[PDB]
Amino acid sequence: RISALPGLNNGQLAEEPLSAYVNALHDHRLWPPFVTHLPRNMEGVQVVA
Amino acid sequence: IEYSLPVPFHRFYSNPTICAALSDDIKRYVTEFPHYHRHDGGFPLPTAF
Amino acid sequence: AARRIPHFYRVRREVPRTVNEMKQDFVVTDFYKVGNITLYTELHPFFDF
Amino acid sequence: AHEYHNWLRSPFSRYSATCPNVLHSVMTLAAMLYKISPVSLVLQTKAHI
Numbered sequence: 001r002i003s004a005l006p007g008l009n010n011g012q013l014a015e016e017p018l019s020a021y022v023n024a025l026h027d028h029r030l031w032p033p034f035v036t037h038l039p040r041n042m043e044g045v046q047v048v049a
Numbered sequence: 050i051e052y053s054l055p056v057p058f059h060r061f062y063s064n065p066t067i068c069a070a071l072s073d074d075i076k077r078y079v080t081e082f083p084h085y086h087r088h089d090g091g092f093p094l095p096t097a098f
Numbered sequence: 099a100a101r102r103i104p105h106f107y108r109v110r111r112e113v114p115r116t117v118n119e120m121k122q123d124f125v126v127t128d129f130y131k132v133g134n135i136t137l138y139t140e141l142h143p144f145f146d147f
Numbered sequence: 148a149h150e151y152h153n154w155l156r157s158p159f160s161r162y163s164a165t166c167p168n169v170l171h172s173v174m175t176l177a178a179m180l181y182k183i184s185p186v187s188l189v190l191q192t193k194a195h196i
Binding site (some may be wrong): 006007009010011012015018019020038 | 082086
Binding site (some may be wrong): 057075081086095096 | 101103104109112
């Protein structure tokens with residue numbers, strides 16, 4: 001709740017919500033250190049083994 | 050979950066998460082537009098409402 | 099209406115915000131500034147345009 | 148070991164290394180993840196943060 005400004009995160013400019021532009025917790029390019037499922041959104045992100 | 054039908058019809062009483070759980074169309078719609086997953090209103094009521 | 103709620107969200111397309119909703123966007127300080135495009139509408143305390 | 152191409156750099160661990168174990172340090176790690184970009188600047192400034 002803190003991380004995304006709910007009073008201003010109301011829109012898009014790319015095919016991404018504004019809340020992704022303001023806080024890293026909200027965009028899909030940053031991953032959590034531990035994964036058990038792959039994410040739904042992986043447009044420009046590519047994963048390397 | 051099979052006999053229940055969601056109806057977002059008010060500024061209150063229009064939680065996106067519940068109505069996304071209850072119907073697959075609203076699930077697709079919310080995944081398209083994550084910025085609509087918000088509770089200050091702003092989540093688009095249908096054209097009749 | 100209750101049955102055609104899904105038909106509205108079937109259309110994977112965005113909706114415009116109302117000027118009242120876009121007007122709530124502004125903090126008390128900068129509601130009066132030139133950056134508030136919605137000011138041309140705030141004509142009457144008791145009526146919205 | 149690629150620090151300079153990483154997302155979280157050394158000041159993050161330098162903070163979490165001594166922060167007290169209360170909710171406020173969690174919220175602080177979150178607010179530190181605010182992105183710095185023109186879009187993020189306007190979103191933070193319009194909120195007067």
